[PDB]
Swiss-Prot record, chain A:
The active site is at residue 93. It is found in: Cytoplasm; Nucleus; Golgi apparatus. The gene is DUSP26. It comes from Homo sapiens. Its EC number is 3.1.3.16, 3.1.3.48. Belongs to the protein-tyrosine phosphatase family. Non-receptor class dual specificity subfamily. The chain holds residues 61 to 209 of 211 of the full protein. It catalyses: O-phospho-L-tyrosyl-[protein] + H2O = L-tyrosyl-[protein] + phosphate; O-phospho-L-seryl-[protein] + H2O = L-seryl-[protein] + phosphate; O-phospho-L-threonyl-[protein] + H2O = L-threonyl-[protein] + phosphate. Interacts with HSF4. This is Dual specificity protein phosphatase 26.
From Swiss-Prot, chains B, C:
It is found in: Cytoplasm; Nucleus; Golgi apparatus. It comes from Homo sapiens (Human). GO terms for biological process: negative regulation of ERK1 and ERK2 cascade; negative regulation of MAPK cascade; negative regulation of transcription by RNA polymerase II; positive regulation of cell adhesion; protein dephosphorylation. Inactivates MAPK1 and MAPK3 which leads to dephosphorylation of heat shock factor protein 4 and a reduction in its DNA-binding activity. Inhibits MAP kinase p38 by dephosphorylating it and inhibits p38-mediated apoptosis in anaplastic thyroid cancer cells. Can also induce activation of MAP kinase p38 and c-Jun N-terminal kinase (JNK). GO terms for molecular function: MAP kinase phosphatase activity; p53 binding; phosphoprotein phosphatase activity; protein serine/threonine phosphatase activity; protein tyrosine phosphatase activity; protein tyrosine/serine/threonine phosphatase activity; RNA polymerase II-specific DNA-binding transcription factor binding. GO terms for cellular component: cytoplasm; extracellular exosome; Golgi apparatus; nucleoplasm; nucleus. It catalyses: O-phospho-L-tyrosyl-[protein] + H2O = L-tyrosyl-[protein] + phosphate; O-phospho-L-seryl-[protein] + H2O = L-seryl-[protein] + phosphate; O-phospho-L-threonyl-[protein] + H2O = L-threonyl-[protein] + phosphate. Residues 2-148 form the Tyrosine-protein phosphatase domain. Keywords: Cytoplasm, Golgi apparatus, Hydrolase, Nucleus, Protein phosphatase. Its EC number is 3.1.3.16, 3.1.3.48. This is Dual specificity protein phosphatase 26. Brain. In the brain it is expressed ubiquitously except in the hippocampus. Expressed in embryonal cancers (retinoblastoma, neuroepithilioma and neuroblastoma) and in anaplatic thyroid cancer.
Length: 150, 154, 154, 153
């Protein structure tokens, strides 16, 4: 789709999710952290109407880009979002999971006393690989058969 | 443009990867399983020159689409790829992780006798979340700073 | 210019590989263990920019040289490398596989409790004998012709 | 300076071995296949006097080089060598395992009815990783200690 709840109230999602009003409202998203904001496209206009608080971080998914200057600010924003009653935040990038996941991991290390190894394990454990519930049902049926001896 | 080696020689990747001659050649990919094949477009011509063997499975990423009809065919192809000396397979679909990951899970269940739960854990454990090595270094630098605050008390 | 992944994330390679920025960057190497290090030349300058952590072990490839003094130190370094998120280590020596492979085997015995015989089998099973991918394709083409001669009779 | 007997009488070795008259004699080498022969350096001069038969195939260790045109010639030479009691062939190249191993694999497939997978397994099983017998002794000592209960040194 996609978005994964990698920490309570904390959704790691993709650009399409960030652009999708039905889903944003359905999830009850109150904050959006765009880890690939383009100074040349501004804040998404749907967001004020949705009552969504926005933080855009201008970041390129390049190994020479310094994301670290945004670690604390982004973590603070995530903390604000999750600290609000009913607060739920979507963290996403335009493409690739590196930019958004990096800010989530920094948040977990700074606000939830996890080591990087522990934070990585936490996020990976909650990243789904079969969002398609039909396919999951199909795999479960296969599982039952193979367990039964096939 | 990303792929994870979720099982030895078995890359779960995206459409961008499947299109990239340089990366395919670099990874030494020998087989490609396209889990969202188009019947009327056929096989990517690039693969003939790269010496890549191809299997296309026509599938829609819809919960009403029955992917199970492809479980054995896809698993057999993955088995053939990995059984070949130096064999490395890229499994991908046009968009979304569902189509390709489903076939990988079926392979693990059928050929390595993992339960679905075990297969899911195996794949999840091997999907990286910081492909950007610069960012990883920056996070490790943060991790080191935090640990050294701890070490200074101890 | 070659390296074998003889254990997940653990590359046994040659001096040329250790010398190649592009290959190191492409493989995502994070640590290098040089089993034939030179005291007074220090750490390779290229490793600083690549973000590579280095351990040099001073060793001679002579049957009278005692490598055992380095077993634990080298094994600990390999363990640290592989324990790091995204960690990948290249172990090499200036020439000959003796110095580097010895440290890899010691690591497998110490940290994974393999017997020497089991560790040797594991490494041997993962050293490619046809690194040249062209030659491999050519051998596979021969293999195919031989099989098809059989299939034509059956 | 090493050679592995990967098939009875068939040694897969390095350049140093090919250069060492003393080792060649100690092994009883009768044939040498140089898989990286250099046209301008010709046949090693020592071989004629020692009665060693030589086949040199001119090959580059590059992915665009077609080694397959030498498959049959190399395989035939190897088979002749191994056809006589006491026949022993050293197959080698200047550097890298690819050129020499490729000819050996082709020989096993053509003359010993192995699939490529089987031939690869055979060669890999007989390829040494620690030529240094001192280091091997040291690892064996460690092995005994760990088996006796030791956890770390």
């Amino acid at each position: 789709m996609h978005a994964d709840e990698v920490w309570p109230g904390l959704y790691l999602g993709d650009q399409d999710m960030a652009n999708n009003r039905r889903e944003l409202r359905r999830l009850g998203i109150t904050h959006v952290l765009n880890a690939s904001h383009s100074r040349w496209r501004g804040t998404p206009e749907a967001y004020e109407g949705l009552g969504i608080r926005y933080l855009g971080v201008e970041a390129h998914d390049s190994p020479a880009f310094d994301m670290s200057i945004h670690f604390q600010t982004a973590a603070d924003f995530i903390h604000r979002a999750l600290s609000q009653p009913g607060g739920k935040i979507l963290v996403h990038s335009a493409v690739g999971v590196s930019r958004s996941a990096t800010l989530v991991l920094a948040y977990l290390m700074l606000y939830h006393h996890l080591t990087l190894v522990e934070a990585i394990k936490k996020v990976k454990d909650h990243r789904g690989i079969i969002p398609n519930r039909g396919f999951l049902r199909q795999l479960l049926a296969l599982d039952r058969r193979l367990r039964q001896g096939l």
